[PDB]
Every structure is written in structure tokens, then in C-alpha cells.
Amino acid sequence: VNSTAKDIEGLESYLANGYVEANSFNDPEDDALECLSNLLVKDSRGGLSFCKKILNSNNIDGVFIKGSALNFLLLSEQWSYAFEYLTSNADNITLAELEKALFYFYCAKNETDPYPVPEGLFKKLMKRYEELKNDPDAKFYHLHETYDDFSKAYPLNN
Amino acid sequence: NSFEVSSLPDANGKNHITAVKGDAKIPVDKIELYMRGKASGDLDSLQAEYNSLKDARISSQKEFAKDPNNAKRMEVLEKQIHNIERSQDMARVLEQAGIVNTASNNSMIMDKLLDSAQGATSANRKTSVVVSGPNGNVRIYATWTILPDGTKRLSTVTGTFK
Numbered sequence: 001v002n003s004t005a006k007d008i009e010g011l012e013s014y015l016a017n018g019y020v021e022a023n024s025f026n027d028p029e030d031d032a033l034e035c036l037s038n039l040l041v042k043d044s045r046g047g048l049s050f051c052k053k054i055l056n057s058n059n060i061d062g063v064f065i066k067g068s069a070l071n072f073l074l075l076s077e078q079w080s081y082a083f084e085y086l087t088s089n090a091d092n093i094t095l096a097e098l099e100k101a102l103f104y105f106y107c108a109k110n111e112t113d114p115y116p117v118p119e120g121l122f123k124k125l126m127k128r129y130e131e132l133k134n135d136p137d138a139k140f141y142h143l144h145e146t147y148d149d150f151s152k153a154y155p156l157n158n
Numbered sequence: 159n160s161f162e163v164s165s166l167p168d169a170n171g172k173n174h175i176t177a178v179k180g181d182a183k184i185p186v187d188k189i190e191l192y193m194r195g196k197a198s199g200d201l202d203s204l205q206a207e208y209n210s211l212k213d214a215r216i217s218s219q220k221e222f223a224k225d226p227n228n229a230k231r232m233e234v235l236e237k238q239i240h241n242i243e244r245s246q247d248m249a250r251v252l253e254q255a256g257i258v259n260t261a262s263n264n265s266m267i268m269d270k271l272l273d274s275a276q277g278a279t280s281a282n283r284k285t286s287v288v289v290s291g292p293n294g295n296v297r298i299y300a301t302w303t304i305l306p307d308g309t310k311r312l313s314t315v316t317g318t319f320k
Binding site (some may be wrong): 010018019023028034041047072074075076095104106108141146 | 168179185217219220226233234247280286300301303306311313318319
């Protein structure tokens with residue numbers, strides 16, 4: 001069972017080499033998710049730092065884990081960074097990031113005081129969905145179902 | 159033109175049967191995990207635990223968000239279910255094409271995977287091959303880990319490109 005230092009080591013290895021351990025026969029993205037989420041509950045600051053590094057990396061083959069990193073930020077004290085990242089990157093966020101974003105706001109509808117939504121973000125997200133909805137990989141993120149939940153939560157906005 | 163089957167140890171010293179060809183490697187267990195719908199875990203109980211978390215978050219997201227152990231569990235469960243659904247989908251794809259689950263078919267698939275990996279550098283860790291069956295052809299997609307010695311170890315096989 002890893003210390004926070006070892007989880008951090010594994011995450012820096014994943015970012016630099018594409019694996020958490022050279023001789024782990026697991027999918028390294030699965031190893032990276034274990035490391036990232038184990039870090040997050042032990043060391044919030046460090047956990048959210050590596051969420052940010054994962055979103056900004058240009059050298060990561062994993063797609064699911066970019067969703068994870070986005071999702072942990074959305075549900076943290078640093079939600080605003082995630083709102084800003086989405087606004088700035090909507091044009092090219094992945095399937096996984098789009099689904100987390102759409103799901104987050106679907107849920108947010110039930111909050112008594114939801115966070116202020118940046119101007120134009122919902123329109124951007126919808127546009128990006130139209131760009132990605134025919135991707136044959138979309139169904140593994142239940143993108144279409146999550147889009148319907150989102151649009152049904154914001155119908156005047158449709 | 160052949161591949162070799164030997165046993166190689168992982169980071170904890172545990173040996174894994176592995177198919178080797180040139181500078182590429184496939185732990186043979188990957189066939190069950192990713193291609194034949196025997197990914198790890200029990201789908202029904204996993205989905206039941208994920209659903210109760212998802213429903214808690216949908217109804218009270220702020221309160222759910224306060225304890226990151228919630229996000230941690232839900233996301234880990236989500237990836238396990240996601241890996242199972244991709245693997246069952248791959249099994250469905252091979253079955254539809256008549257590529258039944260036999261030693262020869264699985265050897266065929268691995269040999270072609272190993273061939274596709276021979277070039278791979280850190281500049282591109284993804285390959286794909288066409289496998290042939292009694293009910294037509296299908297493209298399958300693999301991602302690879304580049305090891306410090308430059309050889310490749312299969313990470314995943316999926317029915318769709320990601």
C-alpha cells in the first residue's frame with residue numbers, strides 16, 4: 001500500500017513514461033487512476049495538482065483519465081479552474097471530458113445555489129457534442145444518454 | 159514466422175505467461191481481459207454499487223463532493239464497469255464475425271497484434287490490425303507501453319479507436 005510519495009512517483013512516471021511501473025502488466029491508465037484517486041483522498045493539494053498536470057499534458061495516451069482529472073477538479077474547491085479549462089478548451093476536449101462536463105451540470109441543476117456558469121459554456125459544450133456524438137467510441141461513455149439528461153435539465157436552453 | 163511463449167516476472171516478482179515476437183510482448187491473459195469479455199470483477203454487483211453513488215451525487219452533488227472518498231470510489235467503479243463493457247463489446251464483435259474463442263484464433267490475433275507493434279516508438283504507441291473470420295473482417299485497436307529498453311508491452315485491445 002503506497003505512501004503519498006510513491007503515488008506521486010507513479011504519477012510523474014505515468015506523465016513522463018506512460019507507465020506507473022515499468023514491469024506492471026496492468027493497463028498503465030488503470031494504474032494511474034489508482035494512484036491519482038488514492039492521492040486525492042490523502043493529499044488534496046497534491047491530488048488536485050496532478051489532476052491539473054494530467055489535463056495539461058500533451059504526452060498521455062489515456063482518455064478516461066483526463067475525464068477523471070477533470071471530474072475531481074469539478075467536485076473540489078478548485079471547480080473554477082475546471083470551469084475555465086472547459087471554456088478555454090471546449091473546442092477540443094475529449095469524449096471523456098465532455099461527458100463529465102455534461103454530467104456535472106446535469107447534477108448541478110439540483111443544487112440550491114449552483115456555481116455561476118461562465119458565459120457561453122453550455123453553448124460550447126453542446127457544439128462539441130455535435131462534433132463528437134457520432135464517434136463510435138462515444139457509447140462507452142454513455143455520451144448520448146448523458147447529453148439527454150443535460151438537455152432535459154436545461155430545456156429552455158435547448 | 160512464429161512467436162515464443164515464455165514466463166516473465168512483473169514488478170512484484172509474479173510470473174506471467176507472455177507471447178513474444180521481435181521487440182513486442184503480449185501477456186496472454188490480455189486475451190481474456192480485453193477481447194473475450196472476461197474482464198475482472200462482477201458486473202452486476204459493480205453496477206449496483208456505482209448506481210447508488212451516482213444517484214446520491216445526482217440528488218445532492220455539493221454534499222457528495224465534500225468527501226472525496228465518494229468521488230474516488232465512484233470513479234474507480236466507473237472505470238471497472240467501463241473496462242468490462244469494452245471487453246464484452248470486443249467479444250461480441252469477434253463472435254459476430256465468426257472468430258470463435260479458440261486457441262488458434264487467439265494465436266492468430268496475437269501474432270497479428272505483435273506484427274503491428276514492431277515499429278512502435280514513443281512517438282506513436284497505438285496500432286490496429288484487420289483480423290479475418292467466417293462472417294467478415296474486423297479492425298481491432300491496440301495501445302502499447304514503451305519500456306525502458308524500447309520494447310513494447312500490450313496495454314489494451316478495443317473494438318473502437320480511442
